[model samples]
Target: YEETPDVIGKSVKEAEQIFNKNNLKLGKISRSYSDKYPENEIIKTTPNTGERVERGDSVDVVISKGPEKVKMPNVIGLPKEEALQKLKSLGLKDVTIEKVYNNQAPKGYIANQSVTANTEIAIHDSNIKLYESLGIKQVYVEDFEHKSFSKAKKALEEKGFKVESKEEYSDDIDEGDVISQSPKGKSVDEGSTISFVVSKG
Candidate 1:
């Protein structure tokens, strides 16, 4: 039995020569994307180095295509399936999707390609981060009993709600406190308008 020669990391021509020297015939060659190996370099051999093989047996090799670059497609506003399919169709091996929930974007949609479209890219992992919308983000109102109008406006706005305030008389709520609010249900859509009644005492 002839031992397989170490052809890994060797170029295609070198690997062919090594196989011949080991009395092994070169077999089908395949190409694949590799992060560590450079283009046209042999990444692996079918029988692997040091493996025993019969004289005249064929040895296949896997060549490194290395990292490849392609034009980025703008998938922003596209349906999740459409966006993902588009990237895969474009020969990008490591396309990915990330989900985001918000009222601004429609649910299950994409926000375009990796960074900006038309930029050349040849990344290894997380090559593309498509924002898959999880739908409108809903927020619960935190009742602000005796809360100051200024604080409430800031708080509500941070909760992704629109804020509006008007003054009214209510000695029980103190002189400058929020007397009451609307949509008392607490469960409100983000960006929904929230009105506050300030104490006029």
Candidate 2:
């Protein structure tokens, strides 16, 4: 049996070296939050200090992880990438993102935050949920050929689409009728302008 050295107050690296010098191997490591001891420092040992142990025996230790509570940062209104980086920099690893449609906020930006700003949150709490905005829903252009100009104009305007009318001389179509329409049956964003060719009989 060998006399184990006191390693309760040493750092993790120093403790390991001391054990190796004493013909003993360092064992499993555990961590707990502590206000008195700095992080990575040994708080206690499984095998009480000054105990007798055989050579090549292992000693488990608990290391300090600093204070338990950490402050939550304000990430609202910031971009998604920027918010994530800020959280990680503050040692917060649990972060979850959710993208959703939001008309009030711009696209690719943060819309809502789970944690309150400047509040103290437990370090082991659940992931911080971030809601991202995907902007307003887009509306597609519809087929307006062979339809009355008045009817098509009203329909397009109701769906938030701007109508740009262009009159053309058409022998086959009557006046005030739609001759052709640009981007007919094609996809377009909301509030986009759609050009229309009307018959000038």
Candidate 3:
């Protein structure tokens, strides 16, 4: 008769030798990911460590496969804020969001993601980009102040935006040049009216 040895934190090879020294046999070996144990470290053993058993009895071992990883989640179609909340709940920290017009998804909902769902990823190291839908196509606007009204109108028109000019007298602005614009440096729907003030020199 012999008392089983405790080898919970030892490496499998080390456990094998310890069991050998105590007249026990190292039996089946298994491995799995562990958060509390490092790679190759023994996690557990059969028949419970320190239990009395006959000499040369087989002692099966379970070992570690390093730290566990977080699985990438599916958040497509969820609202932008909701998806962000879900990803953060999974311990993700490197997530980002972008807004764009998408006919495939509803407005304010997630339209696309950079990482595939169910893919294994590290919690703190993985980077993911989520695209939020705007529902309708949008056009970007640039400030036309100080630019020639004719060229500014042409540029805006070329980008699918129509221009409406309003005349204004100002000594601070050159004649025939734009004085100010409504909805300047912002995004608007395609074909939306762009109102501008031209200096009436």
In the predicted model 2, the residue pairs found to clash are none
Model 3 TM-score, all chains together? 0.58
Kindly report which residue stretches of model 2 are placed more than 4 angstroms away from their true locations once superposed: 1-82, 91-96, 101-129, 133-137
Q: What are the per-residue Cα lDDT tens digits for candidate 2 across 68-136? A: 777888887889999899988878779899998777778988888888888887666647999999987
Q: Comparing 1 and 2 by lDDT, which wins?
A: 2
| Model with the higher TM-score, candidate 1 or 3 | 3
TM-score, candidate 1, is 0.55
lDDT for model 2: 0.84
TM-score of each: 0.55, 0.47, 0.58
- lDDT for model 3 comes to 0.84
Please report how far candidate 2 places residue 171 from its true position, in Å: 2.4
Between the candidate structures 1 and 2, which one is better when assessed by TM-score?
Answer: 1
lDDT for each candidate structure = 0.78, 0.84, 0.84
Candidate 3 structure quality by residue, lDDT tens digits, 1-201:
666798888988888899899888899999877878888888888867777788878898889977767888999999988898898888876888888888779989999888888898866457788899988687788777888988999988887677888898999899988888877666566667888989998
- List candidate 1 segments past 4 Å from native: 1-69, 122-126, 145-151, 157-159, 171-173
Off by over 4 Å in 3: 78-104, 114-116, 122-131, 136-154, 157-187, 191-201
User: How do the residues 32-69 of candidate 1 rate in per-residue lDDT, one tens digit apiece?
Assistant: 88878998888888888888888889998999987765
